Every structure is written in C-alpha cells, then in structure tokens.
Amino acid sequence: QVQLQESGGGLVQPGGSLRLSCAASGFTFSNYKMNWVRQAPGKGLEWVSDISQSGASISYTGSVKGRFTISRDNAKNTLYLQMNSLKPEDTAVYYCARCPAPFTRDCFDVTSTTYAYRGQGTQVTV
Amino acid sequence: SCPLGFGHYSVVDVCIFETVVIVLLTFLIIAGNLTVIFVFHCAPLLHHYTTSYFIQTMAYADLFVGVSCLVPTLSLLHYSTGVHESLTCQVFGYIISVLKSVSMWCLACISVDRYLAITKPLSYNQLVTPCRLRICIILIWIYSCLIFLPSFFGWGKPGYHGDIFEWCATSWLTSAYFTGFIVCLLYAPAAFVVCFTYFHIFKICRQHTKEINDRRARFPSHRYAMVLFRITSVFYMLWLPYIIYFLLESSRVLDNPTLSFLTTWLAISNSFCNPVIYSLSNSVF
Amino acid sequence: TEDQRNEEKAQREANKKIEKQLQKDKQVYRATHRLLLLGADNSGKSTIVKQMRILSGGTSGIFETKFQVDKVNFHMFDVGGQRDERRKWIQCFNDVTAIIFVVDSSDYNRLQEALNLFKSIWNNRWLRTISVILFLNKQDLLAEKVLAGKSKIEDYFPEFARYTTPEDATPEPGEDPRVTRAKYFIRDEFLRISTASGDGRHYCYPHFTCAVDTENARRIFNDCRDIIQRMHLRQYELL
Amino acid sequence: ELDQLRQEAEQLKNQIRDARKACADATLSQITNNIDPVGRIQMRTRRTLRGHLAKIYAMHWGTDSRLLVSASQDGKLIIWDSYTTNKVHAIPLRSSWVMTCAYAPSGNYVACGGLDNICSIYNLKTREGNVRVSRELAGHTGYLSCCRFLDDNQIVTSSGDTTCALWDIETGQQTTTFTGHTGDVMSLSLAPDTRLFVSGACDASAKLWDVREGMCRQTFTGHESDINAICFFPNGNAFATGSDDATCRLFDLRADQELMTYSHDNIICGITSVSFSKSGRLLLAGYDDFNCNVWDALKADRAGVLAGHDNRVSCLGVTDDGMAVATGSWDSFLKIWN
Amino acid sequence: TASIAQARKLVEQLKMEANIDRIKVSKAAADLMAYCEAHAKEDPLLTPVPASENPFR
Ligand SMILES: Cc1nn(-c2cccc3cc(Cc4cccc(C(F)(F)F)c4)sc23)c(CO)c1C(=O)NCCO
C-alpha cells in the first residue's frame, strides 16, 4: 500500500524550529518528486515546497526560502522539512505529498478532495 | 563529343561511353523511384494530405523519366533503324521535356503550398482543398503538354534531350524565338516562385528567431520534413546549368556538345531528389 | 455465390457513402481551431468568454464558445463539470491549438497556485507541444492594490525588492512605475517558468487584459497565427 | 472511542495483511519454472483501419469477432468490419470529448461517453434504418471513463467522480451505485459470468464488486500510481492491471493478493490498456512508448512486441475466439494483428 | 457514514479471510496453470494456424 506518514509537530514558541519527517512506504522513493503542502485552519490547501527525484532541484513558496529547508533521504525513503523562525501564519496541518507519476516534472498535489498520495498529516501549532 | 574520342557519331554508335552513364543513371532513377512509389502508397504513415499528392506526381513522373530514358538508350545497342527514327526522336524529346516540366512544376507547387501554410496559416485549410489540389495537378500536366507542342508543328527543337539519336543532334536545331521564349515562359515562373517562397519563409524565420532569441536572452535558463527544404534548392540550382546552356546557344554562335551532354545529364540526374528525400530522412524502416 | 455478392457490394457502397461523409467532416474539422480555456474561480475566464460571445448554453458542465475572427473559426472549451483533480481529463487536449490561461493578477495569495498550475501544464508529457496564451486578468484591480498599499507583493514574493523593470516595455497600460514593475514582475515569473524547459516546441504569449477589455479575440488570433507559423517553421526547417 | 476505532481499523489492516501473507507463500513464477516457454511471438499488421480524424481512446470488439466499434475525439463513433475493412457505421456525437465506447453483446446497441458526464446509448437496428440515440443516461458528476454492457438493458459505467454505477437503460435510472474509490475510476472489466466486475482507480487500487449485492467484496493494492487499465483473466478467478508506474500486475480473487509483476528496467512509461488472449497464456499491454508488449503471463517475460504506431497506444482488444488483436492509438489508426 | 462504511468493509475483509476454504497453498497459481494448459491449443495467438482458416490473411 502507498503510505505516507508524517511525524513531528506540536506547540512551539514563535521563532522556533521543527523537523517534520515523512516516512514513505509502498513505492520506490527515488523515482518520485516530493512536496510539502499545508492547510491553515479555515483555509484551503496550499503548496509549500517541492524537491526533485535526486534532490538537486528545490523550490519553496512565499513562506521564505531561508526559513524552510526541504531535503530527502532516498536511502531511508523519507522526506524532511526543517522549519526555522516560526511565525503565527505557519499554524497549519502539514502533508507530505507524492506527486502521482514517476519520471515527471509535473505534479498535481493540492486538490481538496481525497488526493491519494498524501499523508494523513501532522499539526504544527505556533 | 566522346571524351575518349571515337570519331564523329553515326548509325554505327561508336562511343558507347556516352550510353553507359545514361543507362546506369536511369537504372538508379528507376530503382529509387520504384521504391518511393512503393513506400508512400502502400504505407502512408506520415501523409500530410497536401504534399503527398505532389510528391506522388513527382515519383510517378520521375519513374517514367527513368523508364523512357533507359528504354531507347538500352535499345540503341540491340535495335537500330535508319528510317522512322526521326519521329521517334521528336516523340522521345517531347516526352522527356514534358516529364521534367511536370517534376519542376510539382516542386514549384510544393513551394507555393508551404508559402500558403506560412503566410496564411489560420485560413490555410480553407484556402486549399483537395479539389483545388487535383485541379492544380491537372493543369500542371496540361500546361506542360501545351508548351512543348510546337516542336511537332515546327517551331524548333524544344531541348537537347533527344540528342541521343543521330539526326536530331546534327540537323534539328533550336530556334531563337518560340524556343527559349515559350520554353522560358515555362521555366522562369518555377524558379521565380521557388525563390519568392523561400525568401518569404526566411523572412518569417528571421522575425520569429529574433523574438525567440530576444526572450531567451531576457531569461538566462538551462526530421523527415527538414530534408525537403534543402533538396528543392539543390534540385533548382542543379537545373541551372542546362538552362544557362540552352539560353546561351538558342540559335547563336556558342555551341559545345560536351557541355550539352554534361548539362542535360545533370538536368536528368536531378530526379535523384525524390529518393534522396526519403533516404536521408529514414535510416530505419 | 450471388447473394454474398449482393451483400458485399452493398457493404462497399455503404463504405463509400460513409467515406464521403467523413471527408466532408474532415474539411469542417480542419477549418476550425480548438482552444482549451483554463484558469481558476477568482480569474474572470467566464467574462472573457462573454466578450467572445458578444464578439449557459452548455448543460453538460463543459462550456463551448464559438467565436469568429476574420473568417477563422475558434472553438474554445471551458471545462467546469469535473472535480478538482485534473491529471486524466487534461490529456484530452493534446491536439488543442493553444491553452488559454487566465490569471487574477491582483490577488497575490493565489498567484503561486497559478504559477504551479502553469508549471505542471508546461512540463506535462502530453502538453509539451502546446503553446500557452497567457491572459493576466483584472489589471485594473492590480493598479488599485499597489497604489493603496497595505497589500505588498514582497510578503508573498520576497524577490520583488531585488527586481527592476526590464526596459519599461509598454508603459501605457500602467502609468505609474510601481504598477508597471508589479505587472512585469508577475509576467517575468510566468515566463521564467516558460523559458526553463521546452526545447522550442512551445512558447508563452503573455497579455495584460482588463475586465472590460474587448480585443482579446484579436490577441488570440494573432498568438494562434504565431503558434502555427512557429510550428510550420519547426517542422520542415531546423531553424 | 476515537482512539478505539483507530486501533480497531489499524488492527483490521494488520490482520488482513497477515492473513494474506499466511494464505500463500509460494509464487506462480516458481510453480511455472518447469513449464516450457512460449518463445518469440511474431504478429504482423494484418489490417490497418483508417478514417478517424483525431486520436482514439476506446475500441470494443463485437461478440461476432468481426465487427468492432471505435471512438475518437473528432466526434465520431465508427463501427468497422475487420474482415473486409469496411466502415459499417459512423455515428456523429454531440460531445466530441468521448473517452469510452462499448458494443452490446447482442449487437443491437452501442454506448459512448466522456467529459459530457453522460452515457449515450445509440440504437443500431432501427426500422427507419439510420441510427439514433436511444437513451441518454445522466447523473454522474465527473467524466465517464469506461462503460460495459451486462445485456441490452443494463449498463455499468465508471466515472471520474470516484464512483461506478449500474443503470437500467430503458428507465434511465441508476439501479445501483458502487462507491469506495477515493480517486478517479479509470477502467472496468466484467466477469465471464457477469455477476462481478473489477474496477481500478487513480488511488492505485482495484476493487471487486458484486453487481447485484451492490457492495465491494475485495480490495487489491500493490500499484504505486494511477491504474489505467484492468482486465479479467479468462477463467474469471484472476485479473491483470496496468498503471502509470510502468508495471503490470496479476492478482487472484481467491488468494486476494498479487501473483505476478510484469515490468522491465527499460520500460518507464505507463500502461494505458491491457487485455488477455483467449487461453490466458499471453497478456497484451499497450504503453506510452508507442508500442505494445506481449507478455508470457505465466513466467513474466516479454514474449513479443507490436510496434507500428506513431503515437501512444490508448486501446487494445482481443476477440472472443482470440483470433486477432486490435490496437488503437493517438495516431488515428487501428491495427489488426495475428 | 463513510468511516462506518470503510470500517465495515474492513470487517467484511476479516470475515472473508476468516474462512475462504481449506485449500492447497499455491492452488490458485495451479488453477491458472491448469486453465492455460486446458485451453492451450484452442488459442489462435499461442498456436499459429495456416491462412486457410485465418480470415485476416
Ligand atoms: C548515345 C549518343 N549520344 N550522342 C550525343 C553526342 C553529343 C551530345 C549529346 C547530348 C545528349 C543529351 C542527353 C544526355 C544524357 C541523357 C539523355 C537522355 F535523354 F537520353 F536520357 C540525353 S546525347 C549526345 C550521340 C550522337 O549525337 C549518340 C549516338 O547517336 N550513338 C551512340 C554513341 O556512339
């Protein structure tokens, strides 16, 4: 089964730092581009960051590129997001999202519906 | 005229070196045109619905060029006649002249079709219809037949193709007007429209390449049809030596038989183009 | 035998009738140019449809807009009946002449969503030969947002402070240089997505359009002309 | 009881996974190592069927193994005689975004549907002699992906609204609705006894459904991406799936787990269509690398290749007697192979 | 009651893998092999036939 499991979260003082870890099982990790998405309370899902298959190509959203650091461990089949200098706008539910097809540079991961290759999610409060 | 030198030509057919290059070249034309005839009609995988018909007419006409140039030249060794070879010479010369004319005008129509595709792209399929295409092919054949018809009624020799027979090479002569006048009214429009269409295609390519390179400089960041563009130009500037010799004789003092043979030998070998169009494009099959 | 001869020649003449009908249908199909309208709810892509309807009939969810620009027929399809996931039904539009992309440029919160949708369309395997005609809608709302303040682009895009106007390309739509820098920064975001990939097979055609703009049909005509010219120039020429 | 319910559901998942791994430890590949291989399968394009203006998504064979129907997004539904390459019928469609077509096993009706969210049933045998639309089935809220006729009055449709549906044709009402997929359902196949049908969706899962009971018996996972094509093994106790992870898989119903994986290192594009031969020894799959692969279904080796299409292979069909394979593609041509 | 329906689906899976039957461990694989052996020579694709009884040739 294609499973993504998020770990890390909880209360943190503003300006803190967290390390969200997404464990991936049921598929080859190296062949898929990975994303971090979040859903603010009373708001829709918005994409935060994405990292390529090897990990070389990396991009972030308007939440500053300096605060957040995405990385991936293809040997460990896991996806890390290092969250620095937390602001109260960062209170959201965070999802690691595999984008659907391998060997692709296109990904469709922020659908409100039951997008299959998204984790159950973790809560970050700040 | 024999480069080795066999004396002046007669019914004896002394210099067979003249014949063998013709026979081999027309054999290659027959083989290549038979192959291209087989490959579009049996397996039209890439067709494009407009250039296919004109290229098909080219392949048919060029295969008939090869057959109608190989059969008399091969037959000259076996069967030779002293009488009734004259009318045979006008018939052969007219046939070869008309067939080369329809091949040239078919590439001219490729040129104007590509110009209509570039210049009026959104109304292109409205403007050209397969009924108009078939009408264009029919008037190509009719026009080529009607231009060279006065060679039968006695306005002069239409071309140097029929020089393989003895009597046309010596006695029958080109004329100044209605030969190189009506005949140039046939040849000059084809060269004009090919040059015009490629000039406009290169102007459009200049504008689009300018815009693309300007945007690429603004943002620093990380095969079958292509053959047709070059080989038509190769075809037309291969037609030029025969046209230059034809005009430069045109019943005036300049006359060279070796230049005649070489120039119309190139003018016949330009029928290599249609097999070369498919051979360079498709390494696999 | 004889009755199977009757049956087979009746089958052949039925095939001939079918084939002449299909060649008429081929002429009608080649006469028209098909566009895929795509965008979001905040973008006024339904409004631009209303200008080409001047210059809800569709009850199947998908919208059809037929408009006529100088004896050329354009059929634009707005897909609305489907879900939010669009992986599979976007593959039906590979042979579309151009994707019309409509962006709300005043709203900055969903600009990144539009950029990501543009990137996914641009890098898709079945859409990598389709040029995109980009309409940046509600440019009048963009001007009132930047001049009033309190909604800074720098909050959503931290590289706007390090950006200057490229050459002051067309100052007449946006008079004040702040408005010009804002709209040209958004345009450069979409075109730096466009120029990163795509080996000359397709290009973006950005425009700055208002809500009451009435020349979008002519813009689509000119961009489609350039698309077909570039396709022919790429096909039989390397250049 | 929220923690108790989550613990119960996780224990249910672990229990069924352990039940699958304890049900069988052997594989069909180690069972069939003694079996002689099929060898090279050479198939030739016995016919080329031309006449579609645009790309083709769907075809369906008739039960006579001679007639077939094809759907293309130029707006035409063309019924072809494969023996003599004659176009028997050409139905113009109201919506030109058709994605599926089904030919009724009696031969009297044909079906189509697509982005219009409507299944159109066209009557072929009419007294006036020219085909009209018999029924217009509306009620799905997404595009229609696949439809199959149970008989002349029952139609089953998979849609992009994550649901399947059994409709009674003459009354135009959804008799049964099959829910449980979370992604867009892309394909369905009917069982030989037409009591069951499987359906694969974009959630990398396949589901077996009872037509009369209206609920899902079994769920099959193992794919890593969207499932584009599903097909029963001819016995009806197994089925194969093709998906976007460049992999085909063979599952058995009674064992409720995957028996084989058909993939190779050089194959990276997804599978668009799958089908079985009449015996079930050969599994044919259409790909996005523009050709089809014939697989030995009992040892998972690439037995043959069907190259000959200039674009991706969208549909693939095998006759009831198994004589020929028809392959459609985005290059607007069908090909009949033996 | 989507969660209740999914939980009951998992319950139904537990009921099915409670008692399928007392079978051989690789019996389903043997069933597939037996079907492909039993319908082997009747396949036109697997066993090639001359062009007399093949209407596409
Ligand atoms: C054979 C031959 N050539 N010649 C020539 C002498 C001087 C110039 C030319 C120019 C020619 C034009 C041409 C060139 C290439 C293909 C063709 C084609 F149309 F036939 F294909 C035509 S032929 C020829 C003669 C005697 O005039 C003879 C002959 O009478 N007997 C045999 C030889 O000893």
Residue numbers in the entry:
A (entry chain N): 1 to 126
B (entry chain R): 26 to 247, 262 to 324
C (entry chain A): 9 to 63, 201 to 254, 265 to 394
D (entry chain B): 3 to 340
E (entry chain G): 6 to 62
Sentences from the paper on this structure:
GPR52 is a class‐A orphan GPCR, which has been reported as a target for treating Huntington's disease, cognitive impairment, schizophrenia, and neuromuscular disorders. Previous structure determinations showed that GPR52 adopts an active conformation when bound to G‐protein in the absence of any ligand. 1 A self‐activation model was proposed, attributed to a built‐in agonist motif embedded in the extracellular loop 2 (ECL2) near the orthosteric ligand binding pocket; this would also explain the high basal activity of GPR52. The synthetic ligand c17 is bound to a GPR52 side pocket, as shown in the co‐crystal structure.
